[PDB]
Design a protein around this ligand. Structure first.
Ligand code: NA
Ligand code: NA
Lengths: 428, 428
């Protein structure tokens, strides 16, 4: 990669949520292996982000590589319309078996936002088929479910700047963000807001949608499992569908295979992505119950009205399959368990740093919330200089490393966070 | 694949737009090579669909294969937030170079519907930043733009069963489907469109259409004069023009991009399907400096979107290799020769009783029937003829790989003519 290459990227290439007139620096990666990213100039970085929570087995994993190459030898892609294939079947087999019992119907798709759109469409078509006028969604503040129109309609209105689309997006119901902590105690006062909304709109609510236990992009919040129990039961009593968006929490990240396990509940609709493929390429899945799948198919439309061009992509399914196989060994439990203890122990000190507001850890997720917003360009440069890859945002410096990280590598990550928050150099 | 594998697929795996209470047969594919699919029983099928218009160079292409495997050796994925890489740089250079001059800013995404979602979001953010109350989209009837909620809102209300979502979907403006055929131009065709423009010009955020070919909404082929007039009306009113080329892009209609047929440039361009040579999902939305800059200078400070697998290196490497094959220029004469053979060999369908119309454009051949096809019976018939053809509603259509051998194309056109001779394969 030359500097002419980099100039082209700056001038012509949009990146996620970032200015085109005032872009900040981006770092050129040429390769990756184990828990390391390798920059154009040869510098090696310990990855603390797992490429946004997806690369749970790291990079250039032998088993993922072998699976992907063997699938390329067979066929990289074939359409799913009237056709099925081994990688899709094996993948759906594992997904059904590894999730609660009632979730036995799988809709594969290409990205997490699309998986959410699917869930929402499933809920609307379900009620339409039942003859009930239910088109509203009840969600939590601080939630994040994707960037498409429907997914945006259930994202935190303030976080996502809904004023930009005021009049275009449908207006849903927003209960207050859950206050009780995953670490701490339950407080029944937490429920009043949600109960008042349910009492007033019970008759028009299509589904309740939330991220179980951990609210990711909306604040790295970690709330009490009692919430899911309460919600599940309310939805049960009222007949309302429950959608669990586990695109970020799925596949071992919070200490359990699926965060719903922390509450011992099952949603009617389950959304999966990110770590599904071991972070090799995009893929998503939405699982539901027989009751939902059949009810939809029996309505006016005769089917679930959705079907993306690359639905069931073999290459991505094979990668996903190999990822799940690594997990079946059960090794991830001990790895995550150990990462959780090392994160609690090594981020604890940051609680005393002046720029820190809170420190929370769950599974392989370690968060340092600061009092002021970070200086993006300066802090990013700092992490790179320390030989680590950490990508902060707003007031959140967080780590979510591959499960195969070595204690020495993890220690390099925690050391870097602790050093970043020791004064105001990199803030505002 | 065992029989138990197939049974599992039937009862637990959703497929595109098809019933889970009355599921129809699917055919198990083990691999693919050249222009053929290979079933579990050893049967080889000539692919007439290109996996829904994407696999323009066929299957197991050695160059596509080597490019994917090589990138896997370097890294199949790394996040795009704060990072860039060769495969994305190289792809954006080609996309910018091969499209019209004003289209020079690229937003890569994972699927086509998202590309459209991105285009619609660009138009809304653009007007918001300019302080103008513009939230309507003006489009054509019979249009198809994707399955996610925003895309759905510009799809044909009747074809897409909008009654199902009445009250959730924003209400856009729908001008009459273009009548003039790809045929003589009739000025009266414009009355509709003009009426809508006059009553809502102050409110229209953008005009969105599929240029020349309306695919999924009816495989319709209309006069290029329409694009000329729409470009002129949009210039005059100062409205943005979105051209959805997810289906027409990369050679399909005999020109690299269908907007060429009118020598017009849109403000926003959507690409997908054949972008990667049909190996895996990837999409792209290009726009102008005016749009990208205006948006980044508005209140949000950026364009508000960023999928997790944005810029996926493996997908980008695949697309680069696919674009490199097209660079040779061989596709032009390949598509021209396919157009001739389609015209010549579909002509006979005009003597068949079940046919309503026959139309061909570039590598696309369409036989529209008088009655809806019997999906299960017609699909099995084609498989028995050693071809893969996937019809729908009243359309039996062909979009084969550019490298298809004349004897392979003959097998496809022969099967179509046979299917439409009588009622056997019709209704259900
Ligand atoms: Na299950
Ligand atoms: Na261009």
């Amino acid at each position: 990669m030359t500097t002419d290459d980099l100039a082209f990227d700056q001038r012509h290439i949009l990146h996620p949520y970032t200015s085109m007139t005032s872009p900040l620096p981006v770092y050129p990666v040429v390769s990756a292996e184990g828990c390391e990213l390798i920059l154009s100039d040869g510098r090696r970085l310990v990855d603390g982000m797992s490429s946004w929570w997806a690369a749970i087995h790291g990079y250039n994993h032998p088993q993922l590589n072998a699976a992907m190459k063997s699938q390329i030898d067979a066929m990289s892609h074939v359409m799913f319309g009237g056709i099925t294939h081994a990688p899709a079947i094996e993948l759906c087999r594992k997904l059904v078996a590894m999730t609660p019992q009632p979730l036995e119907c799988v809709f594969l798709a290409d990205s997490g936002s699309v998986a959410v759109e699917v869930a929402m469409k499933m809920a609307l078509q379900y009620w339409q088929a039942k003859g009930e006028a239910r088109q509203r969604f009840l969600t939590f503040r601080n939630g994040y479910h994707g960037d498409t129109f429907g997914a945006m309609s259930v994202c935190d209105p303030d976080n996502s700047m809904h004023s930009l689309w005021k009049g275009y997006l449908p207006e849903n119901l927003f209960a207050p963000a859950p206050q009780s902590r995953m670490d701490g105690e339950w407080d029944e006062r937490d429920m009043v807001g949600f109960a008042r909304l349910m009492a007033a709109h019970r008759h028009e609510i299509a589904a309740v949608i939330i991220e179980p236990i951990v609210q990711g992009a909306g604040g790295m919040r970690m709330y009490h499992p009692e919430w899911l129990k309460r919600i599940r039961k309310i939805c049960d009593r009222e007949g309302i569908l429950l959608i669990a968006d586990e695109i970020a929490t799925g596949f071992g990240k919070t200490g359990k295979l699926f965060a719903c396990e922390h509450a011992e509940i099952a949603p009617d609709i389950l959304c999966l992505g990110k770590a599904l493929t071991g972070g090799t390429m995009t893929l998503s899945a939405t699982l539901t119950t027989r009751e939902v799948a059949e009810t939809i198919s029996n309505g006016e439309a005769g089917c679930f009205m959705h079907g993306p061009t690359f639905m069931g992509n073999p290459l991505a399914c094979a990668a996903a399959n190999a990822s799940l196989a690594i997990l079946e060994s059960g090794d991830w439990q001990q790895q995550v368990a150990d990462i959780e203890v090392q994160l609690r122990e090594q981020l604890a000190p940051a609680r005393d740093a002046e720029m820190v507001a809170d420190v929370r850890v769950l599974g392989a997720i370690g968060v340092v919330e600061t009092t002021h917003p970070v200086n993006m360009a300066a802090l990013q440069k700092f992490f790179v200089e320390q030989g680590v890859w950490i990508r902060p945002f707003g007031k959140l410096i967080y780590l979510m490393p591959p499960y195969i990280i070595l204690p020495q590598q993890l220690q390099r990550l925690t050391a870097a966070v602790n050093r970043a928050v020791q004064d105001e150099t990199f803030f505002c």
